[PDB]
Design a protein around this ligand. Structure first.
Ligand SMILES: N=C(N)NC(=O)c1nc(-c2ccco2)c(N2CCCCCC2)nc1N
Length: 246
């Protein structure tokens, strides 16, 4: 997250931190995710497509720090890693950048809600907030594009939804953004998602509760002028999601 603020998991209790185990036994951070029901975390396919073996992934819930324990955190293995059959990666964009991780503890259980762990509501199909609406993004991703390290503490910021009309201008993303994506940016281009925030939540109030409107997918640079964050439009994927969560 570029700009924004440090936060704790209690302000974004649906946030999931996804890591990969490596042959030496080194474990490194992969991507964010969001808990949409006790047994299911939603994220982005591009995070996993290069190594799609479920047995190498670890999901944390209730976690406020990247490389140390938070009280009340829960660790899960991945019982099913479901990557979108039509995923593809273009030159800039990813398409159908959406993945589901069925989580199960080594003790055989799904997530139990707490002060630090809650599910996030899904939107109604094809229901999105109006453009100009302020939404929240969260993650352990880079604080600058050029950074080598990820921050140790979870971050959050606020961005505003941009119209497709605006996002599709040639000096924004032109042809590369589609209707299955959503753009969001800071009006002054000061704050943004970045590398390492992929798969994490874009949350907006829709009706009267916080709702998962987007999944961090891609952008050119981070917090660069005329280059918004691009997000998977969750409201376009409910049948896909329901097909696996049923
Ligand atoms: N909102 C944005 N402006 N940007 C991002 O969301 C974003 N940005 C980057 C990135 C980092 C540096 C330049 O671009 C990035 N990367 C970089 C390596 C290849 C792609 C996947 C991971 N992933 C993202 N999701």
């Amino acid at each position: 997250i570029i700009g924004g603020e440090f936060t704790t998991i209690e302000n974004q209790p649906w946030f999931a931190a996804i890591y990969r185990r490596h042959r030496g036994g080194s474990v490194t951070y992969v991507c964010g995710g969001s808990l949409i029901s006790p047994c299911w975390v939603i994220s982005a396919t591009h995070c996993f497509i290069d190594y799609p073996k479920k047995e190498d992934y670890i999901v944390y819930l209730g976690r406020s720090r990247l490389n140390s324990n938070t009280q009340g955190e829960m660790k899960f293995e991945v019982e099913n890693l479901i990557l979108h059959k039509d995923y593809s990666a273009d030159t800039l964009a990813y398409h159908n950048d959406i993945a589901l991780l069925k989580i199960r503890s080594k003790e055989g259980r799904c997530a139990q809600p707490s002060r630090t762990i809650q599910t996030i509501a899904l939107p109604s199909m094809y229901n999105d907030p109006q453009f100009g609406t302020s939404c929240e993004i969260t993650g352990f991703g880079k604080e600058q594009s050029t950074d080598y390290l990820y921050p140790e503490q979870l971050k959050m910021t606020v961005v505003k939804l941009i119209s497709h009309r605006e996002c599709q201008q040639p000096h924004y993303y032109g042809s590369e953004v589609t209707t299955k994506m959503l753009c969001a940016a800071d009006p002054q281009w000061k704050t943004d998602s970045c590398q390492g925030d992929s798969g994490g939540p874009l949350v907006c109030s829709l009706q009267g509760r916080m709702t998962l409107t987007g999944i961090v997918s891609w952008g050119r640079g981070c917090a660069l002028k005329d280059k918004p964050g691009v997000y998977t439009r969750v409201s376009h994927f409910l049948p896909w999601i329901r097909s696996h969560t049923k």
